[PDB]
Amino acid sequence: MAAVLQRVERLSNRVVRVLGCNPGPMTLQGTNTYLVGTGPRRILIDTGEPAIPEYISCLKQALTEFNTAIQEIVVTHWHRDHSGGIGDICKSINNDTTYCIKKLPRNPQREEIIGNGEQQYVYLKDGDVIKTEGATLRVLYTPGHTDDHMALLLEEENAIFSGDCILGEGTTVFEDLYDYMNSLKELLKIKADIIYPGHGPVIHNAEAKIQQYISHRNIREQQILTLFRENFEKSFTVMELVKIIYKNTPENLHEMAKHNLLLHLKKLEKEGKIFSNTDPDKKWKAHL
Amino acid sequence: VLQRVERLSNRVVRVLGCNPGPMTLQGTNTYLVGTGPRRILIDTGEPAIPEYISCLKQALTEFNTAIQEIVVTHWHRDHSGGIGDICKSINNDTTYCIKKLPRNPQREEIIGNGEQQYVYLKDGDVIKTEGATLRVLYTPGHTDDHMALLLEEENAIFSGDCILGEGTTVFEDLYDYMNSLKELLKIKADIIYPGHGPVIHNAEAKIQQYISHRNIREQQILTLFRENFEKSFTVMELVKIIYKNTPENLHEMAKHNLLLHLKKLEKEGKIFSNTDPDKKWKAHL
Amino acid sequence: AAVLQRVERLSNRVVRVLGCNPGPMTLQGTNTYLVGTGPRRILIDTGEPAIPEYISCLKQALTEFNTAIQEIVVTHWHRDHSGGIGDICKSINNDTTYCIKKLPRNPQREEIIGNGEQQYVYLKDGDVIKTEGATLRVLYTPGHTDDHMALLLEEENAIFSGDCILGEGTTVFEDLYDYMNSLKELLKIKADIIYPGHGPVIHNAEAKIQQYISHRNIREQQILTLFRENFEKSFTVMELVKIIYKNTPENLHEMAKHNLLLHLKKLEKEGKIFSNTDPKKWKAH
Ligand SMILES: [Zn+2]
Ligand SMILES: [Zn+2]
Ligand SMILES: [Zn+2]
Ligand SMILES: [Zn+2]
Ligand SMILES: [Zn+2]
Ligand SMILES: [Zn+2]
């Protein structure tokens, strides 16, 4: 049932997609790296995984086929399927000048090493604009997936490069559900026409997908709150909650359920709906 | 010469990491524990060894089984390095659950691309599979996160790099290392499945060999200090005296070994150091 | 640009093995050197990680010049100089494990070699590394990196400059103040030859170091003149780039902005210019 994506493909007058050639459980058909612009120098969004020689061949084929070169490299987040190929591109895709690699900083800030260590990131900020011939990209800070997660708005198409915030097929993972839901709510306000995700096919129904993503998490949150508000006098452990909430989940997915539940509890805790205690087996309980 | 895929018992299959080297001997010993269609995998080899993934696929096909979960002894890249490779190459219905002890003090530990996370265990935790029960044994010394596992059905220890099947191992803290060896002795295990080298059938004799080896050198160092209790010694003074029968090409190994021994005796309040630019060591009393 | 052959005897004491890692920052590749005249020699730098071609070249060099590795000396932490450590240990067979020497990071940091079981032996400025037919004095040259080590081959009056001085073109650095100071220190050595980390051999050492000093000093004079002429004015990084880097194209704006900031941090450290706490403007002092 998963779509078979081609290694090099012209998606629009301004976007060309090169597959990372790194399929897997977390990357789907591979990392979707994009060449944005209409001129002889284009912006490269993401670089795939480290040491994938097939991607360098595909990237060289796209640049030759579309008679273009890399202007600069923009990385959505630190995950190695988006930032791993930076060193490989610098060494293999010959250029007059060294490449400029832009990214959002880590939150809190951290030293991030590129290649051998002589190359450094140029850090951007929310609302920054990246310009090329025929394309203007506005930087949209979308934390949740990662603390440095950057989505980009292609103004000329009203298109979003969502990175790993929104995927072309299936759902995604995140570190913080509170920031993730807030980023989805912010992307909704852009009212974008198309989403170019970090993995999976192109999304033509942006509003419906983001709303599907919000509803999926909200239904589970409503289930968890109902349990707490119906049993206000009980302090529940994670194991207690997992057995009640994820009753329709098999035992082989216990650790995934436990992890999902904790992401939901940290969101409700941050919102002040539930409080935890300092017990060795941490207990959660409804307040007020 | 260890063969790459081998059934060691009714519950254990050894898959070699295909990463031989000075520190890994013939390669990392990874083990498939259990008797059912889903087994526990202990250690994963090094990063980017495609030969190991082929050997692991051969074992799973040969023994008509699959991975239930992955258990990592310690953070060293010959033990935790192949996780990303297994997740990408050994196809499964669900993503793998990777279990390990936390770092001490705690640290962020990145698996693969960064989207996979460790499920952290604690000392005494039990990992169950069809036909096998593994008790988690915290054995620090080699590393601050080192885990040994007790296979209850065989009274067997998966020692990781705490105990090797040939020669000795390295460690960070001699005090914790010696304490872990003393703890493993109390288990009174029948067999040891080490992280490198062949299987150990006389567990008691091997752990006692490891303890005695370190204790002989500690006794030599302590005797020098307690006999010359009014004297203070520099590291270079002590290396020339203690490691007299060791060649000059092994000087840095000797100096390193001595310092590991001196930090244990210092922790034990048997010796004390001073604030001199060339640090001097004297017996306590 | 000169075409360097992979294995070459440059001296009665020095033999160079190319890293087989050409690129924008490494030129024709990392220059790794075998120093000494005996059956055991010192290896300066190890190339990049996972370059199988380099291990073949290194094995050819050791066979051709009937020698072996005594110890490994790393100029700095950059992966094109410390990357091949694990590959050499695994592939170039030896009786004992290799001793890998380096200067510490400043401030100190955990530095992982290979799988994690190997550790660096840290040196200090002025330390001497001896082999049959060669004596190397450790020269702490920070600037390029905070751990950067240059070495003086006493018999030849030669400098293994690492990434401080390159055979062709310019180099990059983290701190211009320390970099300029290290170049001034290397000038005092009055070396005959310079064996760089990348590029061909430097036969006119004085002229090369003075070319490297003059290149940075011309730009510093340009910046300082702008500040001293407009002593009442305060400038931002964007204001200063547009004025100073007038002869730099818009495609190199981020490189210019980065270069400028390295120059401003040196002048700030020297108390020639001062910054403010504005959401940032530099003014004369
Ligand atoms: Zn991704
Ligand atoms: Zn991601
Ligand atoms: Zn090991
Ligand atoms: Zn180990
Ligand atoms: Zn360097
Ligand atoms: Zn270099």
Author numbering:
A (entry chain A): 1 to 288
B (entry chain C): 4 to 288
C (entry chain B): 2 to 280, 282 to 287
Q: What do the study's own words say?
A:
LACTB2 crystallized in space group P 1 21 1 and diffracted to 2.6 Å. and showed no evidence of oligomerization in solution. β sheet sandwich flanked by helices and loops. LACTB2 lacks the CASP domain, and instead has a smaller C-terminal extension. and R220T severely inhibited the ribonucleolytic activity of LACTB2. mutation of D81 to Ala, which retains RNA-binding but not catalytic activity.
(C) LACTB2 is a soluble protein. (E) LACTB2 is present as a monomer.
